[PDB]
């Protein structure tokens, strides 16, 4: 189909609307800028390689670049690998970007630099030097960079990246950088708040350095700011997970009253570990656009009970109060200042690691009448007691969150504790159903009816890694009319009870997943077929249950689409001359998908296939030490389209695959042990469209294996990480995967001969055989 | 060393007191016996392999055979293996066995037989035909067997091995088998006792067959006998994990009051899912000596209330009253009849699955002035209430079993419920003294009321429970004797550094899979709890996903073993995060630390300058290494044994003995070695056990194996690698076929991977003689 084949080790994208060609070569294992790039190419990306110089030659041609992404080919010792460190910091020799004359963005991160390059052209407006060893920013370095707009100059003197002095920036820098809108000085050893900087700035990262005090004309020209961080200076340092040195004198960051006093564009203040003890109202004077304020990681404990500077925010949407306790103090109640209900346009309030035992409906009231309230946020606070009847008062919330407290009768897993949250990498939920209450990780041992009293609104609720271990029988959720989802993952189901769950007459998904503990135990009735009672019920996730045994026989259901059961023990359930189970699955009518990876499933029971329900669709049996499969039983099922046969032992493919199933669209052989291919193996298989045969053993494949007239109808063909044997006996397969236009990923990568000797190693893309044609 | 190399694929053993030449080819994937067998063998066993027929060829030479283990080279389709299932049974020629004049044991389960085999030599006293497909024993065919001794029939018709017909067997078929001492006729689908057996049966196992009546004179002249199974039959099928089918009208195997009146040597009765109702009594007349009653998976509930027949047993040792429980009842109390106090030698008592809400102390006073009982076993009960203080008056015993039960403020995992615990195949605390086991309850919250009078306890088994408290040195304080706790499977909140504390004989912790608190960020963390625990040997604290912690040294002066695997050391070490660096360094006793499954894909540097001084086994397995420092080794000066299986590594250092000068245990297997340094091993004196299988090496040379540091290894794994049988090879396949260097699997896995000719063949029958014309 092709004339040319596609030689070039990167991916090559068009965008003939934007006048685009984007080469992508990141993570190519290349030491040296591929020959033969587009000279038409727009977007360079060489992320993540050991290319150890740029010169003139590099670019030479590429004359129509506007972006060149050179990220991490030198990172930082502590930063990047330690298998295959960087022996030297990438080379920039002169005059190897003067030639680009549209060059609007260059990403030199990560590369060690010692200095600013220079020679840079006048058309950047992007520069981003993160992680490199630039800690001494002198005016005459910035003269080149006239129409810079953003400039990324953090992690360039911090614990991951030492450079073992004090950040120095020269007096008035930035100042004649008058397009500059945003500036990121952060992780970098900051002394002083640089200036003056330039009136243009809307965005100012100045978080993670040695800031002690803020002058009061630091930021009196910045009238066009938006965004303003200085969190991380003066940090709270308790259970930090970096190392955290904090002011002396155990100072907060010291801030006049007067700072912001320019800054009223501003929407975004972010003021986290700064070890504040007040929040003067003056600050927020001539602010009045505020809408996020981060005042996490302080020690303004005693300030939440008072807050005046609320008054001063009717336009605030976030505000974050979290892990403000102090240290060996364990409040008896939330002390909320009648000040948080003059903050008529909060959406978002989050206040963890307050640190209380006791949770009142009264001690909320100050949000009683915030209109646009959508997130309530109380996790991580040790609650012993709170009556959930209290959120009756609360029906207008998306979410209420009290994850990870002491009840009993997604933000990032590390986000408040984490050093540089939006730190840039250089290695390689039920929200959606409406009102949810989230009671995850808490100690719930027994649940009934009245602890759900007046939330008969809630449509999601997420009991995940409770103690609940008992024998629920129907009648615990009773007032949950409205509940669509279900989480009682991670708690020990006692299943004892065919009408588990059935008072939940709306629920269309129950996850009781790991809820492994009573399946562990011989003797014990558990009764599977309790599926039967829930009418709307659409997918049901039983994974990780090491499920053995069941007193019934069967699972029924009208209304079930989605069973996931991996992590069971069908082998033990289907052992070889026990029937009783080949039909566990048979009436669930309207099952279209169904896991059942993880089975410890070495071979199958005839009458498994047989015994599936009749609209079967996507059927997982990965990851089961599966080391036959007599394929031919494929044909009882009869709606099948994707097959996963993933990480399993099989040795072989059918004689063919056409009469095995007339509907199979995708087979995944992934992570398998096959040799050969059968010499008809896709003859006539027109309904075929994706095939993984990735990471097999095969040596050669034939045209009779392969018919062209099925190979072009694929979407997809993954090849990779086989043992091709590149001899003359391969030349058709090695033309046909040369000239196809059939997807085939990692060809520059990983589609490689094991031999003979002379082409070991060898990419089949670029293997010339013309020595067989002599 | 060797002036012959052993090509046998089979393991031979010379033991010369016994007069035995033992050769073991268990499953070497042979299709034939293999040549060479030593003429002298004794012991041949060629159990699991794919051999189709036995002919007189097979045991030509080896007139000297004892015993033939010939099992399993053929098994029944339902047993067996469905990736290479048998095509054909086993075919067995006239006269293969009648020259073997000095055979006592053949075993030939699991081979598709269709007969018993004849021709079989008058020496034989074992034979053993288990999972065969022999459904009809006839007189004519046991004749052979005049001096039969032991006699294995069973599994030849049931569930996983069908016949379709009920097993039959010829009127006096064993009379005249006079030296028979032990038949077992289990698994068989068999409808009657068969009749007239020989009285010199000692054990007669007829379990899990479709017997539904014991004749009163079917047992009649077995005054020898010493065991007698007859369980699974009208089993009981409630929850049963095989198909079970129940006798018809839920009656029980019917078994008349005198059956037993012949067996006066008795001293095992199993009685198993037999469905009974009742036991009479006089059952129990003649026999004076029972010393093992298995009455588990019956319909007990009501006579163990009653239990006159216990009044029959005052030498008996152990009882079995296990799921005996009546469908659907909950019961509130345990009702176990005063006729228990005339167990006078009992030791063991077992009554799971008796099913009731409440333990109390009066309901086990039956049990008070049985002097001898060291096992009580009450699991699998639904117990909700006990007050643990009532076990004040059984300080005597060795274990009190209290596990999987509701309770709140070793046998296999499926032996009550398995088909047949004693089938063949194809294919803890109690040492330290009085042991509590509360594992597998409900218990949320303890306190120290909650042990009052227990101080005597040794061991305390709270693994799987519910605890998720903040404990802080109070929860335990009467427990002062108690050596082991495992609080494992709890969600432990180690907010104190007192936690544990009042346990001050404790030398064996297990707080491993705790993770649940170390998985939220900002919760305080005290790993400095080690210091209060003054005698404390062994620490567990394995899959806590642990990542972060408040403090920053653990220290002990008594810990000799910490157990670390499945938590976050890479987090803790961060690169560039020196904090943790001395973690362990002042566990000042420490021998043996286990890291393993720490994701540490690197070791920052620091780790082995911060380990503790006498520390002298690690393991570094299952971390995705990629790279190691072997330098780094010399701050170990006490190392002994080092893992790093499982890893990425790639290469070995260039002389080992330059890293430590204390090692003598090395495990490198699973990485991806291709090559060795050419000095690798030259002068490493104190190396006595290498591990170099599952790399990807094609080469040895001699200058990296001296023969002055092989001649001191106790083992050398070398299997499945990639080596290379060229001439470059020469040493390396001389040296393998000649020393007396211990190497696993040296015919098996130590394979050629190349070049062409050689290609798959195992490098200890290499010819090389081509390289050397
Ligand atoms: C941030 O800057 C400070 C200096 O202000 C660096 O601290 C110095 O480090 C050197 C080398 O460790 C010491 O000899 C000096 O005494 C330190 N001075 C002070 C004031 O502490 C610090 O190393 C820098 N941080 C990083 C991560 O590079
Ligand atoms: C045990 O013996 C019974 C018969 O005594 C076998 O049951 C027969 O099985 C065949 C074929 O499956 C049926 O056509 C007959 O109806 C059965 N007879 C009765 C009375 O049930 C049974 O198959 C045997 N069991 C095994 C495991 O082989
Ligand atoms: N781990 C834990 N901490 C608690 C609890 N109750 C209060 N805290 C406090 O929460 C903080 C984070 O954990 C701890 O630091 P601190 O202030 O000494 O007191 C602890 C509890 O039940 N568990
Ligand atoms: N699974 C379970 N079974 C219990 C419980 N309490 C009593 N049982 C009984 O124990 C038996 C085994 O489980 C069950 O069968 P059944 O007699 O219907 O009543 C059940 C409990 O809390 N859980
Ligand atoms: C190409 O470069 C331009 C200019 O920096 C950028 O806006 C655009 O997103 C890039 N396109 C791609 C797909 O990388
Ligand atoms: C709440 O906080 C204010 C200011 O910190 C305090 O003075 C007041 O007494 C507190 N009220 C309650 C109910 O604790
Ligand atoms: C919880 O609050 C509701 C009122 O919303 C009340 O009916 C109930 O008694 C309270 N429950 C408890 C346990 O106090
Ligand atoms: C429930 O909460 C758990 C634990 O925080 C979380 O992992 C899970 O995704 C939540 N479930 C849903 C459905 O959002
Ligand atoms: C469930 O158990 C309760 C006791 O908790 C019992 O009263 C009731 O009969 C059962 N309810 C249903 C809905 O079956
Ligand atoms: C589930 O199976 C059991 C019989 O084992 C039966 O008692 C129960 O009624 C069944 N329940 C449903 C909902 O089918
Ligand atoms: C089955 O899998 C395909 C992709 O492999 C997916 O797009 C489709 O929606 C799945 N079908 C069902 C019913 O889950
Ligand atoms: C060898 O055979 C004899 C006779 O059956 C047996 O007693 C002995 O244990 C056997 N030894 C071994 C090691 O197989
Ligand atoms: C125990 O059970 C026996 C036999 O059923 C009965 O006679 C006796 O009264 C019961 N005793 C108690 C305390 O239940
Ligand atoms: C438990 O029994 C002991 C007597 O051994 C008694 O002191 C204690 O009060 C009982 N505990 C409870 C909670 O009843
Ligand atoms: C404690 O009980 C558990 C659950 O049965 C078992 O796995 C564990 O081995 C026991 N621990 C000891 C130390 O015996
Ligand atoms: C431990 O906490 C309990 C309260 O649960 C209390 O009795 C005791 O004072 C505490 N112990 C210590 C060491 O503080
Ligand atoms: C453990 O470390 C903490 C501080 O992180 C300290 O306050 C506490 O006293 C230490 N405990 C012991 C037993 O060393
Ligand atoms: C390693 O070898 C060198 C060169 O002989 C020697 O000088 C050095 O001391 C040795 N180190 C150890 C730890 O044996």
Same mark, same amino acid.
């Given at each position: 189909?092709?004339?040319?084949?596609?030689?070039?080790?990167?991916?090559?994208?068009?965008?003939?609307?934007?006048?685009?060609?984007?080469?992508?070569?990141?993570?190519?294992?290349?030491?040296?800028?591929?020959?033969?790039?587009?000279?038409?190419?727009?977007?360079?990306?060489?992320?993540?390689?050991?290319?150890?110089?740029?010169?003139?030659?590099?670019?030479?041609?590429?004359?129509?670049?506007?972006?060149?992404?050179?990220?991490?080919?030198?990172?930082?010792?502590?930063?990047?690998?330690?298998?295959?460190?960087?022996?030297?910091?990438?080379?920039?020799?002169?005059?190897? @970007?003067?030639?680009?004359?549209?060059?609007?963005?260059?990403?030199?991160?990560?590369?060690?630099?010692?200095?600013?390059?220079?020679?840079?052209?006048?058309?950047?407006?992007?520069?981003?030097?993160?992680?490199?060893?630039?800690?001494?920013?002198?005016?005459?370095?910035?003269?080149?960079?006239?129409?810079?707009?953003?400039?990324?100059?953090?992690?360039?003197?911090?614990?991951?990246?030492?450079?073992?002095?004090?950040?120095?920036?020269?007096?008035?820098?930035?100042?004649?950088?008058?397009?500059?809108?945003?500036?990121?000085?952060?992780?970098?050893?900051?002394?002083?708040?640089?200036?003056?900087?330039?009136?243009?700035?809307?965005?100012?990262?100045?978080?993670?350095?040695?800031?002690?005090?803020?002058?009061?004309?630091?930021?009196?020209?910045?009238?066009?700011?938006?965004?303003?961080?200085?969190?991380?200076?003066?940090?709270?340092?308790?259970?930090?997970?970096?190392?955290?040195?904090?002011?002396?004198?155990?100072?907060?960051?010291?801030?006049?009253?007067?700072?912001?006093?320019?800054?009223?564009?501003?929407?975004?203040?972010?003021?986290?570990?700064?070890?504040?003890?007040?929040?003067?109202?003056?600050?927020?004077?001539?602010?009045?656009?505020?809408?996020? /304020?981060?005042?996490?990681?302080?020690?303004?404990?005693?300030?939440?009970?008072?807050?005046?500077? /609320?008054?001063?925010?009717?336009?605030?949407?976030?505000?974050?109060?979290?892990?403000?306790?102090?240290?060996?103090?364990?409040?008896?109640?939330?002390?909320?200042?009648?000040?948080?209900?003059?903050?008529?346009?909060?959406?978002?309030?989050?206040?963890?690691?307050?640190?209380?035992?006791?949770?009142?409906?009264?001690?909320?009231?100050?949000?009683?009448?915030?209109?646009?309230?959508?997130?309530?946020?109380?996790?991580?606070?040790?609650?012993?007691?709170?009556?959930?009847?209290?959120?009756?008062?609360?029906?207008?919330?998306?979410?209420?969150?009290?994850?990870?407290?002491?009840?009993?009768?997604?933000?990032?897993?590390?986000?408040?504790?984490?050093?540089?949250?939006?730190?840039?990498?250089?290695?390689?939920?039920?929200?959606?159903?409406?009102?949810?209450?989230?009671?995850?990780?808490?100690?719930?041992?027994?649940?009934?009816?009245?602890?759900?009293?007046?939330?008969?609104?809630?449509?999601?609720?997420?009991?995940?890694?409770?103690?609940?271990?008992?024998?629920?029988?129907?009648?615990?959720?009773?007032?949950?009319?409205?509940?669509?989802?279900?989480?009682?993952?991670?708690?020990?189901?006692?299943?004892?009870?065919?009408?588990?769950?059935?008072?939940?007459?709306?629920?269309?998904?129950?996850?009781?997943?790991?809820?492994?503990?009573?399946?562990?135990?011989?003797?014990?009735?558990?009764?599977?077929? @309790?599926?039967?009672?829930?009418?709307? /019920?659409?997918?049901?996730?039983?994974?990780?249950?090491?499920?053995?045994?069941?007193?019934?026989?069967?699972?029924?259901?009208?209304?079930?689409?989605?069973?996931?059961?991996?992590?069971?023990?069908?082998?033990?359930?289907?052992?070889?001359?026990?029937?009783?189970?080949?039909?566990?699955?048979?009436?669930?009518?309207?099952?279209?998908?169904?896991?059942?990876?993880?089975?410890?499933?070495?071979?199958?029971?005839?009458?498994? @296939?047989?015994?599936?329900?009749?609209?079967?669709?996507?059927?997982?049996?990965?990851?089961?030490?599966?080391?036959?499969?007599?394929?031919?039983?494929?044909?009882?099922?009869?709606?099948?389209?994707?097959?996963?046969?993933?990480?399993?032992?099989?040795?072989?493919?059918?004689?063919?695959?056409?009469?095995?199933?007339?509907?199979?669209?995708?087979?995944?052989?992934?992570?398998?042990?096959?040799?050969?291919?059968?010499?008809?193996?896709?003859?006539?298989?027109?309904?075929?469209?994706?095939?993984?045969?990735?990471?097999?053993?095969?040596?050669?494949?034939?045209?009779?294996?392969?018919?062209?007239?099925?190979?072009?109808?694929?979407?997809?063909?993954?090849?990779?990480?086989?043992?091709?044997?590149?001899?003359?006996?391969?030349?058709?397969?090695?033309?046909?995967?040369?000239?196809?236009?059939?997807?085939?990923?990692?060809?520059?990568?990983?589609?490689?001969?094991?031999?003979?000797?002379?082409?070991?190693?060898?990419?089949?893309?670029?293997?010339?055989?013309?020595?067989?044609?002599?």
């Amino acid at each position: 189909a092709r004339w040319f084949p596609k030689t070039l080790p990167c991916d090559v994208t068009l965008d003939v609307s934007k006048n685009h060609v984007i080469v992508d070569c990141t993570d190519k294992h290349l030491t040296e800028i591929p020959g033969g790039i587009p000279t038409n190419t727009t977007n360079l990306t060489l992320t993540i390689n050991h290319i150890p110089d740029i010169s003139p030659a590099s670019f030479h041609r590429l004359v129509h670049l506007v972006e060149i992404d050179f990220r991490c080919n030198c990172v930082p010792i502590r930063l990047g690998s330690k298998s295959n460190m960087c022996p030297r910091r990438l080379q920039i020799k002169p005059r190897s @970007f003067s030639g680009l004359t549209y060059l609007k963005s260059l990403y030199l991160d990560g590369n060690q630099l010692l200095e600013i390059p220079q020679g840079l052209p006048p058309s950047l407006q992007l520069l981003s030097l993160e992680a490199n060893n630039i800690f001494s920013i002198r005016k005459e370095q910035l003269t080149e960079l006239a129409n810079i707009e953003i400039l990324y100059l953090g992690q360039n003197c911090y614990y991951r990246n030492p450079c073992y002095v004090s950040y120095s920036i020269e007096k008035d820098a930035f100042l004649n950088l008058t397009k500059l809108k945003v500036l990121s000085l952060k992780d970098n050893n900051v002394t002083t708040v640089p200036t003056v900087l330039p009136s243009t700035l809307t965005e100012l990262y100045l978080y993670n350095n040695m800031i002690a005090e803020i002058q009061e004309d630091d930021f009196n020209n910045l009238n066009q700011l938006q965004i303003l961080d200085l969190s991380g200076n003066c940090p709270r340092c308790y259970n930090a997970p970096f190392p955290c040195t904090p002011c002396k004198n155990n100072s907060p960051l010291q801030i006049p009253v007067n700072a912001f006093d320019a800054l009223t564009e501003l929407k975004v203040l972010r003021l986290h570990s700064n070890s504040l003890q007040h929040v003067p109202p003056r600050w927020f004077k001539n602010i009045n656009n505020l809408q996020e /304020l981060d005042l996490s990681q302080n020690f303004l404990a005693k300030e939440i009970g008072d807050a005046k500077f /609320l008054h001063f925010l009717p336009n605030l949407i976030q505000l974050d109060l979290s892990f403000n306790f102090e240290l060996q103090v364990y409040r008896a109640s939330m002390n909320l200042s009648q000040a948080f209900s003059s903050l008529k346009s909060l959406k978002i309030l989050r206040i963890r690691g307050y640190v209380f035992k006791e949770l009142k409906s009264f001690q909320l009231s100050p949000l009683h009448n915030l209109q646009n309230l959508e997130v309530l946020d109380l996790g991580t606070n040790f609650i012993k007691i709170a009556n959930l009847s209290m959120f009756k008062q609360f029906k207008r919330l998306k979410v209420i969150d009290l994850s990870v407290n002491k009840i009993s009768p997604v933000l990032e897993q590390l986000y408040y504790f984490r050093y540089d949250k939006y730190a840039r990498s250089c290695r390689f939920s039920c929200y959606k159903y409406g009102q949810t209450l989230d009671l995850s990780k808490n100690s719930i041992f027994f649940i009934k009816s009245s602890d759900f009293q007046h939330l008969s609104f809630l449509k999601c609720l997420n009991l995940s890694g409770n103690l609940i271990s008992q024998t629920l029988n129907g009648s615990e959720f009773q007032p949950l009319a409205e509940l669509r989802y279900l989480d009682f993952s991670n708690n020990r189901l006692d299943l004892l009870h065919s009408t588990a769950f059935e008072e939940l007459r709306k629920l269309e998904v129950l996850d009781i997943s790991s809820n492994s503990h009573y399946f562990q135990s011989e003797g014990i009735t558990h009764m599977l077929n @309790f599926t039967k009672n829930l009418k709307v /019920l659409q997918k049901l996730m039983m994974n990780d249950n090491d499920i053995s045994s069941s007193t019934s026989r069967t699972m029924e259901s009208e209304s079930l689409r989605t069973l996931e059961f991996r992590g069971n023990h069908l082998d033990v359930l289907w052992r070889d001359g026990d029937n009783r189970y080949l039909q566990l699955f048979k009436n669930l009518l309207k099952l279209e998908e169904l896991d059942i990876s993880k089975n410890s499933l070495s071979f199958l029971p005839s009458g498994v @296939f047989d015994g599936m329900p009749p609209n079967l669709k996507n059927l997982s049996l990965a990851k089961n030490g599966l080391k036959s499969f007599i394929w031919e039983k494929l044909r009882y099922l009869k709606n099948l389209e994707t097959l996963d046969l993933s990480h399993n032992q099989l040795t072989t493919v059918p004689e063919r695959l056409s009469n095995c199933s007339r509907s199979l669209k995708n087979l995944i052989l992934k992570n398998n042990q096959i040799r050969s291919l059968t010499k008809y193996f896709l003859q006539d298989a027109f309904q075929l469209r994706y095939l993984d045969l990735s990471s097999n053993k095969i040596q050669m494949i034939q045209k009779t294996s392969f018919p062209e007239n099925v190979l072009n109808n694929l979407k997809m063909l993954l090849l990779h990480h086989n043992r091709f044997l590149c001899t003359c006996d391969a030349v058709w397969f090695v033309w046909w995967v040369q000239h196809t236009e059939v997807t085939i990923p990692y060809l520059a990568t990983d589609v490689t001969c094991v031999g003979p000797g002379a082409h070991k190693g060898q990419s089949v893309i670029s293997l010339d055989l013309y020595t067989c044609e002599l």
